Curated annotation (Swiss-Prot):
One GO term (biological process): inflammatory response
Sequence positions bearing PolyADP-ribosyl glutamic acid: E16, E17
JmjC domain ranges (all copies): 136-302
Sequence ranges assigned to domain JmjN in this UniProt record: 8-50
Protein name: Lysine-specific demethylase 4D
Reactions the enzyme catalyzes: N(6),N(6),N(6)-trimethyl-L-lysyl(9)-[histone H3] + 2 2-oxoglutarate + 2 O2 = N(6)-methyl-L-lysyl(9)-[histone H3] + 2 formaldehyde + 2 succinate + 2 CO2
Gene: KDM4D
Presence of keyword Membrane: no
Enzyme superclass (EC): oxidoreductase
Listed cofactors: Fe(2+)
Residues involved in Zn(2+) binding: C228, H234, C300, C302
EC number from the UniProt entry: 1.14.11.66
Length: 331
């Protein structure tokens, strides 16, 4: 069995290996990368996503989200308070202001300590989930706006044509902006490219150990757990590495820098935070190995999780028994 300790693997594909996306994901899996839940891919030196980032300031962040925390430093929830629209140039200036800028620090580890110690006492503003792409149309390799669609994968595997589309999302972050513990919708893969700016630190639980995280979360968030049998689908709960270690939950951590891809694998719980102003792009995707995870994915039906149009068909075809209840939660 490859990668039996479930370590995060880092890959350095050549330009020739960077041509065929599906083949390279399958190669990574042949080496056990999926066992960690997360892998890093450093593009060949010849590759670029686009020529420059000098002309992105006029992108609009229609609904910036202020991430307000409740709880204790290592065990907290966050809610998103909607703010007035601002451009990327306005957001960058705000991120660099004295109120919001990254503090002085020695190294990534010192910054991580400061994050966990101090996050709850501040409310950073995240430009998340913005439909669009920063890949040049002429970039042919690993262009997240040109991937094979999940609807086409389900059709290829299972023979059923379904409605829906699959497009990327941009994330503009600042110091302390936070992504809560979650798996992807329908336990899909995700791929994330950090276009520019400061790093993003990730934490991940191996898929084979995901239920350990869920059980801890039910213990630590007992009101939430009574409200919903899949409340991590709400994407609001944070648990620190120190707390995970005290409770014996297997996990790993890694920092992504500008120019690097991360892939999350089916049912790989992940969480993390941004170091300072940055821009990432991400999209969900599927492979043949995903289908069995999609069939078994938990679902939120309490009404909180509210998701895209395209998840309808995945539930309807892969989870017909659950469909009626799940759709009530959507309506
Ligand atoms: O970058 C973020 O805020 C969150 N990203 C992801 O959860 C991902 O790419 O799967
Ligand atoms: Mg612009
Ligand atoms: Ni994710
Ligand atoms: Zn719910």
């Amino acid at each position: 069995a490859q990668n039996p300790n479930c370590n995060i693997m880092i890959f350095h594909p050549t330009k020739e290996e960077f041509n065929d996306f599906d083949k390279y994901i399958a190669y990574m899996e042949s080496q056990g990368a999926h066992r960690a839940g997360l892998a890093k891919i450093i593009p060949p030196k010849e590759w670029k996503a686009r020529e420059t980032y000098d002309n992105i300031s006029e992108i609009l962040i229609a609904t910036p989200l202020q991430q307000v925390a409740s709880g204790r430093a290592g065990v907290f929830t966050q809610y998103h308070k909607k703010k007035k629209a601002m451009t990327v140039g306005e957001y960058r200036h705000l991120a660099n202001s004295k109120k919001y800028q990254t503090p002085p620090h020695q190294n990534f580890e010192d910054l991580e300590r400061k994050y966990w110690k101090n996050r709850i006492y501040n409310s950073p503003i995240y430009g998340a989930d913005i439909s669009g792409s920063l890949f040049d149309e002429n970039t042919k390799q690993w262009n997240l706006g040109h991937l094979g669609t999940i609807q086409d994968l389900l059709e290829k595997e299972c023979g059923v044509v379904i409605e829906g589309v699959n497009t990327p999302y941009l994330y503009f972050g600042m110091w302390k902006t936070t992504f809560a513990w979650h798996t992807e919708d329908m336990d899909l893969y995700s791929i994330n490219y950090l276009h520019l700016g400061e790093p993003k630190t990730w934490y991940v639980v191996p898929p084979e150990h995901g239920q350990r995280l869920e059980r801890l979360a039910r213990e630590l968030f007992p009101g939430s757990s009574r409200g919903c049998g899949a409340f991590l689908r709400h994407k609001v709960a944070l648990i620190s590495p120190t707390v995970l270690k005290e409770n014996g939950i297997p996990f790993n951590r890694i920092t992504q820098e500008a120019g690097e891809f991360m892939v999350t694998f089916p049912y790989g719980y992940h969480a993390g935070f941004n170091h300072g102003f940055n821009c990432a792009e991400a999209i969900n995707f599927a492979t043949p190995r995903w289908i069995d995870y999609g069939k078994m994915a938990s679902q939120c039906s309490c009404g909180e999780a509210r998701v895209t149009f395209s998840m309808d068909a995945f539930v309807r075809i892969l989870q017909p028994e659950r469909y009626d209840l799940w759709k009530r939660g959507q309506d």
